[PDB]
Amino acid sequence: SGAIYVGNYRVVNRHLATHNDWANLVWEDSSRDLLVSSTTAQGCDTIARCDCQTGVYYCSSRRKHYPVSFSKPSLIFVEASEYYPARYQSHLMLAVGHSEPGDCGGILRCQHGVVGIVSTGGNGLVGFADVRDLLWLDEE
Numbered sequence: 001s002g003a004i005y006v007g008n009y010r011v012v013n014r015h016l017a018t019h020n021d022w023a024n025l026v027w028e029d030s031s032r033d034l035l036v037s038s039t040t041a042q043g044c045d046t047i048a049r050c051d052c053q054t055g056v057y058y059c060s061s062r063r064k065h066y067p068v069s070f071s072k073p074s075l076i077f078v079e080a081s082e083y084y085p086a087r088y089q090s091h092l093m094l095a096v097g098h099s100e101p102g103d104c105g106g107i108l109r110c111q112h113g114v115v116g117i118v119s120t121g122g123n124g125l126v127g128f129a130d131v132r133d134l135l136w137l138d139e140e
């Protein structure tokens, strides 16, 4: 589990969104595994606006933050999961790192701010849903 709290937005994995998230929906995209809902309180996270390919992510299944090198956002085939069938997920970045299904929502960050959240993994890989192209998260 986990979310990004920027301005009056909450960014979560679409497959972990709550009823309150759907009832206060701003934007969702199943191909990216992302959903954004509105919040009453202002958040403290800042979004990175950069081309970094190195950063640090939080792994709840180890209670640890790990440094990682990650690929550029791309269209990748992801195996079946109970939340989605085997399909192509867009704006996904891969890295070598430990991940388990419940690690979804952990933040990946660089020196500029939040880059994305854990969305996929298995066998020593971890995948992150990028959010750096969502410029509207910085306004309204």
Ligand SMILES: COc1ccccc1CC(=O)N1C[C@]2(C(N)=O)CC[C@H]1C2
Residues within 6 Å of the ligand: 015, 033, 078, 080, 081, 082, 083, 084, 089, 099, 100, 101, 102, 103, 104, 118, 119, 120, 121, 122, 123
């Ligand atoms: C955290 O992902 C891990 C980790 C270890 C093993 C397997 C996975 C992958 C996994 O179960 N999923 C990838 C999902 C997707 N984004 O389509 C999101 C949750 C389902 C579907």
Ligand SMILES: [Zn+2]
Residues within 6 Å of the ligand: 048, 049, 050, 051, 052, 110, 111, 112, 113
């Ligand atoms: Zn950066």
